[PDB]
Write a protein that binds this ligand. Structure first.
Ligand SMILES: Nc1cccc2c1CN(CCCN1CCOCC1)CC2
Length: 150
């Protein structure tokens, strides 16, 4: 009973989280996941500022009201070669990664490891934060509040 959460550097407080390295987070689970990081889904303006500080990914993820990919460099296989905050327009499906926003993070690029999930609640799941450098932090808990997500 295990969940890996792969996390990025923060840029103006915004970061990306993949669950088990596959698109697998619903919109309700995304909100709950950010809440466990004492974070919220980013607004578009928060994401645009993060972009301006150096944030880009090659993965779709939830922000408050849309599913997006922040892009700095044009890449054919990431967001159809777009730059800027690319907004997903047409999709059949409902499960993506998520972005999260932590107001207490540093203002620009913070590529230090994440070593806590401060607002997880009591539960039976081994939750492991996995940083890009491989650094790992594990705890027993839960973050999902909707039955449909579990
Ligand atoms: N941030 C982080 C922390 C721990 C593990 C991983 C990550 C980020 N993941 C990025 C996947 C991006 N793919 C998109 C295009 O296909 C190859 C890489 C790859 C796995």
């Amino acid at each position: 009973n295990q969940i890996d959460l792969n996390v990025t550097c923060r840029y103006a407080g915004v970061f990306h989280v993949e669950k088990n390295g596959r698109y697998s987070i619903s919109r309700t689970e995304a909100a709950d996941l950010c809440q466990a990081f004492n974070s919220t889904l980013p607004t578009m303006d928060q994401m645009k500022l993060a972009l301006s500080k150096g944030f880009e990914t090659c993965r779709y993820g939830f922000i408050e009201g849309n599913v997006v990919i922040p892009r700095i460099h044009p890449n054919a296989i990431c967001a159809a070669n777009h730059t800027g905050v690319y907004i997903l327009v047409t999709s059949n499906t409902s499960h993506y990664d998520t972005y999260c926003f932590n107001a207490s993070a540093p203002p620009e690029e913070d590529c230090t490891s994440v070593t806590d999930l401060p607002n997880s609640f009591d539960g039976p799941v081994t939750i492991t934060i996995v940083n890009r450098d491989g650094t790992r932090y594990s705890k027993k808990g839960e973050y999902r509040t909707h039955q449909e997500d579990i």
